[PDB]
Amino acid sequence: APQQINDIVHRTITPLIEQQKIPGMAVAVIYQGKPYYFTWGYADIAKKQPVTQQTLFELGSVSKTFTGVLGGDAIARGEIKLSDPTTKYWPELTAKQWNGITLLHLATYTAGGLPLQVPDEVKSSSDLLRFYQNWQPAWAPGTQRLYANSSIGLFGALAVKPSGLSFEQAMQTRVFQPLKLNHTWINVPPAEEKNYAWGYREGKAVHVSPGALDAEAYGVKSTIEDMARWVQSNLKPLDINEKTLQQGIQLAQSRYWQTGDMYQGLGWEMLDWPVNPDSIINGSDNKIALAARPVKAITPPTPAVRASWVHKTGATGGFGSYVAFIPEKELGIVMLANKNYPNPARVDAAWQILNALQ
Ligand SMILES: *C(=O)N1C[C@H](NOS(=O)(=O)O)CC[C@H]1C(=O)NNC(=O)[C@@H]1CCCNC1
Numbered sequence: 001a002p003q004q005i006n007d008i009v010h011r012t013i014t015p016l017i018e019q020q021k022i023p024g025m026a027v028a029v030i031y032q033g034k035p036y037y038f039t040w041g042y043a044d045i046a047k048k049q050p051v052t053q054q055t056l057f058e059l060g061s062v063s064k065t066f067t068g069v070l071g072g073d074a075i076a077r078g079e080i081k082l083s084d085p086t087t088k089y090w091p092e093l094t095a096k097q098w099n100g101i102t103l104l105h106l107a108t109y110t111a112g113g114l115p116l117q118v119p120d121e122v123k124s125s126s127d128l129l130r131f132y133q134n135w136q137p138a139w140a141p142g143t144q145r146l147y148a149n150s151s152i153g154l155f156g157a158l159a160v161k162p163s164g165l166s167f168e169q170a171m172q173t174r175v176f177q178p179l180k181l182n183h184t185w186i187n188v189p190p191a192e193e194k195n196y197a198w199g200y201r202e203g204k205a206v207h208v209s210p211g212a213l214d215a216e217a218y219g220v221k222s223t224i225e226d227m228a229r230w231v232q233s234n235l236k237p238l239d240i241n242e243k244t245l246q247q248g249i250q251l252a253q254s255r256y257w258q259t260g261d262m263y264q265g266l267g268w269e270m271l272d273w274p275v276n277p278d279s280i281i282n283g284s285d286n287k288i289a290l291a292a293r294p295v296k297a298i299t300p301p302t303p304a305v306r307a308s309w310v311h312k313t314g315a316t317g318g319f320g321s322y323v324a325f326i327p328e329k330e331l332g333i334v335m336l337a338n339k340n341y342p343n344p345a346r347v348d349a350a351w352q353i354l355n356a357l358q
């Protein structure tokens with residue numbers, strides 16, 4: 001890599017690892033469209049297995065970017081419209097509070113207070129129906145954003161219904177395979193388990209547990225190489241030969257709602273570039289990011305703005321991830337770690353690196 005990249009990465013990430021006690025980490029810096037890879041530490045401490053460019057990390061909520069793009073691809077195929085009522089795809093949702101809740105609302109956390117998590121007690125399809133049938137909104141649709149796995153999770157599950165494919169099969173066929181993300185998995189196959197890092201929480205090696213709508217909201221695992229290619233694909237959608245996927249990427253970066261200086265996409269979130277770094281750093285703290293906030297509709301949604309900071313955080317019990325990119329500058333970063341450490345520390349390090357390289 002260019003010396004300036006090596007220098008800023010060492011001076012930013014090695015101290016972050018020191019400060020946060022991260023056992024293993026992989027970083028990709030995309031500079032002038034090209035990824036440069038860096039790794040530190042161990043994927044499995046007790047086995048002394050190093051992190052490599054083939055190590056799989058849990059992406060946590062970064063998974064939502066795949067879900068958003070898959071939904072955008074379904075829009076571009078004409079299979080769904082964001083204005084469609086939820087009940088078109090799940091007519092058994094007969095409870096009256098669902099009148100007026102659209103796929104847009106589900107995708108963008110604006111349905112009116114769907115909860116952060118689907119309850120752990122939901123183990124079956126009938127359990128899931130009962131959960132949504134009994135949920136009572138705190139707000140009218142399209143007025144407040146409350147980040148929620150139960151919201152975008154349902155969006156993803158319904159968005160694939162016209163295809164006749166399972167969520168996993170749709171994701172593999174329509175997103176992972178065309179983009180050659182051949183080491184990205186909703187379910188890690190047995191032959192790939194050897195590359196699956198352990199997450200570390202309070203000294204214990206952990207992997208994320210199964211849960212309802214996990215694949216859609218927080219369940220993807222990937223390598224630093226595949227995540228760099230994901231960033232490249234989102235930086236340069238016109239390089240994608242499959243038109244529906246090119247357009248799905250663009251639709252996931254359209255601006256559907258605004259709160260403060262942040263715009264909600266499909267999975268992705270965006271701010272105008274140049275960004276105020278304190279707003280992205282501070283806004284990533286879970287006390288802020290997970291609070292309910294009023295939104296202003298953008299109608300029609302703003303088509304993807306090249307001069308944007310586009311990003312997403314994610315975590316599981318044992319992992320912490322962050323992706324950010326700036327299309328106009330062909331500049332991006334992926335940070336994958338096998339400890340869950342605070343979001344503001346991730347975002348601050350990412351901005352120090354990208355700011356140094358602009
Ligand atoms: C995504 O990783 N999230 C959603 C939310 N934080 O948003 S973000 O990561 O800061 O962007 C809460 C934490 C995290 C998440 O929900 N991960 N999955 C889990 O926490 C649980 C594991 C087991 C029980 N249900 C989900």
Ligand SMILES: [Cl-]
Pocket residue numbers: 010011
């Ligand atoms: Cl130094």
Ligand SMILES: [Zn+2]
Pocket residue numbers: 010011014
């Ligand atoms: Zn040093």
